[PDB]
Design a protein around this ligand. Structure first.
Ligand SMILES: COC(=O)CCCC=C(c1cc(C#N)c(OC)c(C(=O)OC)c1)c1cc(C#N)c(OC)c(C(=O)OC)c1
Lengths: 416, 554
């Protein structure tokens, strides 16, 4: 029986107009699924039909979370979100829990439904307009607008922050060491327990939340690890070929943009001379020392790299082949805040795009946990390919920003 | 005892005000006409006389459609439109014949007799005010305002369709066996029912529209095959474009061919094979709007293969949801591709073309991938599903390509179709150095001012070469050097370069380029049995890259 008898004042960013994003073509089945979904939301009063006097529009589609096979409505509120008054709660946000990324484990909860019990400020409703397209522009599109707080909007978690804080006290007061974080329609629970007692303990937080008037049941397990930024490693061989020394010199030269102390003179020296690429060169006294010194510089961390909340996070991804991908998250080039190697998963080494899309979600999730915000992606894929088939594999309630890299980076293998 | 059409709340753009335009001095004859007209319209309810309060005014005109009788008023809300809010124009694009499913019977009701029976927002009417000037202006012109959706006002189309839909909604709901389509003055209703049980449910419609007063003519008919609709030619079970008459002109200007480009593409959606490469590249850049420019000898043999494609009028059929959807692609050269989407052999629902994206380098596989995404999106739009593809590329070729391509790529379900020319991989760089193959260390360098430079190489066996060059750049000398190594080496060879520029071109794996230099290199690579391209950082005393770098400078 939960629904705030009032509505919180909401407006757009000073001097900014509502969204008017075009709706993209949807398959016949996704359409049918949205029709069923909305017909119910209408009766439940969450939404209402609108007349042509409303010009605003935001894209909409359907997906499926992990397990349930049941279709789920997803609204790409990216435009509305960046145009919506950056919720400056008179309480000053929620100081990113630096301790969530340190917890041995973290469980992700879809508390989205909660939102649908709170009414939306009448003056903002027209801004959440979406259309369920028709096949072949035959009939006109079904137009709707939200009555309750919509999942995916930046304002929902804020307008709701009040009700959530108290729906948690009977837990936060109890468990002092546990960490709880909220982002969009997700609740993140970290701890230092063990799978056994960390798994069942969540159930406790499930029913508890289920007793406060509350896809309710889905949880992705997580355990973020070491080397926020992975070390660069040089090969260790007994016999080097000219080709081996050439690549090594290439990697060190590259690494020196990150670590100034790296030297490659004593190694280049072995190169002086036009030898066959597969010929073995013996390492000179001097050369092995440099290879030793460099190796040592690479062990320590990079020089005073810090996160700047004002600047946005950039995420670069490289296709390494055989279902392996690399990525780096940073704000300033050569100053990584995180690097990783998302290995084999669903792509079932048959679909490059499905893999990339999972990688992106995984990178975004990791990003939400460390800084409490999604990063700007640089995808190694043609825009036309990605725009056609990113929504077929998407499964998160949120959506990040992305751009496309069309030139093959020389540094592919160095990140392997 | 009819029920009203709910009114749509309207408003003017924020911060703006209603129009205040002056009225145009009309001739005595025109005035009488308008008075006759505005007199009846007021009776019908359409308009209404206002007092002096209304400060708003919109120009009004009267015109005689030549060789037809009477007059018809015409208001110019050009200014009321620029001050009216925005409406969700859901009229964005119409269906595609290929998306239509055949129906045993298809009727047409004329509901233009409703565009006026639909009220206008009360508080908005004051903005549609207009004045009928008096004869000799020795009297105050008669003032008026609308009580309905004006003809020409920004939001009349948007508000009309919305109202019509709402009224129709219940009918359609309780009549699954019939299909209604609303767009403008016409309502298309079809069904696969007995012609008897059809004109039946039609009466019901005409009658359902009665509960709101809206009258639909007691029509018999005024039409039959070929149904001329939106530049098409529709039939009970087939369609095609309007007769596409190729201008038998001798002097082609910009508009001559440019009105042949946008008129040829139109034709391409059903006639298999049409091309517009050698024709669109003749006016891609040209001064003036029109101009008698020469047609390349190539833009004459393709346009000739047009009067053989535009010779025999071909027909596109209708979509059947029970049959699978198939899409076939062909390579045509110069970066042109055509496709036919069909369900049954030779029964193309539709056809089309795809042109390469303007770029420096490229390869057929990437092009194919692009055509496939296009057809996919167009298919989702027209039929709500992705068609199965039948492509001119071997499965092995495609596997090799995507598993080794640096970018992520994918094509939906497809099958190889042995219809040449087949798309393939022309060369394939090694992953490791080749044992026993000669190692060529190359380099190039030019002089910024003199534009003079050198390209060359030195190998492990002592082979050496350096060629002087004029009117070159650093990038060109870097490519020429690789070219020399390719020309002077055996079937298997290891090339070492410091040119990031070169590697970037080659790693994109082009099979064709704008640059004749890149093309010669491609040509050499095709001839080789094995090539391993290695990169080393510049000015690091790598040698062999350092030795050649010296020979190539100064
Ligand atoms: C679902 O989206 C649409 O229908 C879009 C509407 C496309 C337009 C027409 C149409 C043609 C067909 C055909 N064939 C149809 O049957 C498959 C249908 C149908 O089924 O829809 C109810 C509609 C059309 C246009 C005309 C014009 N001008 C015209 O007058 C000459 C006539 C006519 O019928 O006169 C006797 C018909």
């Amino acid at each position: 029986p939960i629904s705030p008898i009032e509505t919180v004042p909401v407006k757009l960013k000073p001097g900014m107009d509502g969204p008017k994003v075009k709706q993209w073509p949807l398959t016949e089945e996704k359409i049918k699924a949205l029709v069923e979904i909305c017909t119910e939301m209408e009766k439940e009063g969450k939404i209402s039909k609108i007349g042509p006097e409303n010009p605003y529009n935001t894209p909409v589609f359907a997906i499926k979370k992990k397990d349930s096979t049941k279709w789920r409505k997803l609204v790409d509120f990216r435009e509305l979100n960046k145009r919506t008054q950056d919720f400056w709660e008179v309480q000053l946000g929620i100081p990113h829990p630096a301790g969530l990324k340190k917890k041995k484990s973290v469980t992700v909860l879809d508390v989205g439904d909660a939102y649908f019990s709170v009414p939306l400020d009448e003056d903002f409703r027209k801004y959440t307009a979406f259309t369920i397209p028709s096949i072949n522009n035959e009939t006109p599109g079904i137009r709707y607008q939200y009555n309750v707080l919509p999942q995916g909007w930046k304002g929902s978690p804020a307008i709701f922050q009040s009700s959530m804080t108290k729906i948690l006290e009977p837990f936060k007061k109890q468990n002092p060491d546990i960490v709880i974080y909220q982002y969009m329609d997700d609740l993140y629970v970290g701890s230092d327990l063990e799978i056994g007692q960390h798994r069942t303990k969540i159930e406790e937080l499930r029913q508890h939340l289920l007793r406060w008037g509350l896809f309710l049941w889905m949880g992705y397990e997580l355990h973020p690890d070491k080397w926020t930024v992975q070390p660069i490693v040089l090969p260790e061989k007994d016999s080097w070929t000219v080709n081996d020394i050439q690549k090594l010199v290439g990697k060190l030269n590259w690494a020196s943009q990150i670590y100034p102390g790296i030297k490659v003179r004593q190694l280049s020296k072995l190169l002086r001379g036009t030898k066959a690429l597969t010929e073995v060169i013996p390492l000179t006294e001097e050369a092995e020392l440099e290879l030793a010194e460099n190796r040592e510089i690479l062990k320590e961390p990079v020089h005073g790299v810090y996160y700047d909340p004002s600047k946005d996070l950039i995420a670069e991804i490289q296709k390494q082949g055989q279902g392996q991908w690399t990525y780096q998250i940073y704000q300033e080039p050569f100053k990584n805040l995180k690097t990783g190697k998302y290995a084999r998963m669903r792509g079932a080494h048959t679909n490059d795009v499905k893999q990339l899309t999972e990688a992106v979600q995984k990178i975004t999730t990791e990003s939400i946990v460390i800084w409490g915000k999604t990063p700007k992606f640089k995808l190694p894929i043609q825009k036309e390919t990605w725009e056609t088939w990113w929504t077929e594999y998407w499964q998160a309630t949120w959506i990040p920003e992305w751009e496309f890299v069309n030139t093959p980076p020389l540094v592919k293998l160095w990140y392997q | 005892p009819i029920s009203p059409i709910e009114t749509v709340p309207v408003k003017l753009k924020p911060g703006m005000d209603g129009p205040k335009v002056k009225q145009w001095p009309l001739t005595e004859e025109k005035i009488k006409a308008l008075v006759e007209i505005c007199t009846e319209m007021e009776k019908e309810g359409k308009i209404s006389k206002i007092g002096p309060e209304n400060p708003y005014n919109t120009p009004v005109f009267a015109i005689k459609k030549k060789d037809s009788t009477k007059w018809r008023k015409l208001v110019d809300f050009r200014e009321l439109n620029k001050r009216t809010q925005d409406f969700w124009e859901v009229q964005l694009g119409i269906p595609h014949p290929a998306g239509l499913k055949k129906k045993k019977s298809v009727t047409v009701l004329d509901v233009g007799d409703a565009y006026f029976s639909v009220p206008l927002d009360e508080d908005f009417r004051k903005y549609t005010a207009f004045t009928i000037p008096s004869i000799n202006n020795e009297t105050p012109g008669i003032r008026y305002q609308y009580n309905v959706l004006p003809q020409g006002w920004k939001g009349s189309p948007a508000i009309f369709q919305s109202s019509m839909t709402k009224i129709l909604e219940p009918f359609a709901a309780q009549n699954p066996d019939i299909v209604i389509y609303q767009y403008m003055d016409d309502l298309y209703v079809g069904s696969d029912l007995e012609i008897g049980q059809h004109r039946t449910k039609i009466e019901e419609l005409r009658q359902h529209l009665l509960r709101w007063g809206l009258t639909t003519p007691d029509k018999k008919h005024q039409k039959e095959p070929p149904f001329l609709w939106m530049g098409y030619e529709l039939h009970p079970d087939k369609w095609t474009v309007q007769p596409i008459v190729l201008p038998e002109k001798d002097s082609w200007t910009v508009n001559d061919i440019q009105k042949l480009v946008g008129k040829l593409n139109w034709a391409s959606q059903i006639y298999p094979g049409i091309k517009v490469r050698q024709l669109s590249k003749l006016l891609r850049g040209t001064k003036a709007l029109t101009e008698v420019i020469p047609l390349t000898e190539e833009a004459e043999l393709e346009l000739a293969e047009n009067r053989e494609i535009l010779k025999e009028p071909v027909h596109g059929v209708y979509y059947d949801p029970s049959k699978d959807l198939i899409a076939e692609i062909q390579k045509q050269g110069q970066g042109q591709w055509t496709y036919q989407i069909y369900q049954e052999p030779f029964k193309n629902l539709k056809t089309g073309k795809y042109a390469r994206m303007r770029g420096a380098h490229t390869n057929d596989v990437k092009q194919l991938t692009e055509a496939v995404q296009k057809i996919t999106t167009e298919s989702i739009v027209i039929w709500g599903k992705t068609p199965k593809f039948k492509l001119p590329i071997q499965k092995e070729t495609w596997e090799t390509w995507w598993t080794e391509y640096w970018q992520a790529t994918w094509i939906p379900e497809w099958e190889f179709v042995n219809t040449p020319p087949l798309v393939k991989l022309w060369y394939q760089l090694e992953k490791e150095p080749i044992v026993g193959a000669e190692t060529f260390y190359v380099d190039g360098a030019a002089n910024r001012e003199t534009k003079l430079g050198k390209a060359g190489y030195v190998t492990n066996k002592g082979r050496q070469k350096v060629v002087p060059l004029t009117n070159t750049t650093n990038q060109k000398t870097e490519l020429q050097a690789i070219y020399l190594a390719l020309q002077d080496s055996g079937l298997e060879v290891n090339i070492v370069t410091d040119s990031q520029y070169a590697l970037g071109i080659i790693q994109a794996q082009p099979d064709k380029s704008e640059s004749e230099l890149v093309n010669q290199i491609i040509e050499q690579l095709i001839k080789k049995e094995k090539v391993y391209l290695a990169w080393v950082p510049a000015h690091k005393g790598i040698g062999g890259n350092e030795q050649v770098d010296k020979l190539v400078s100064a």
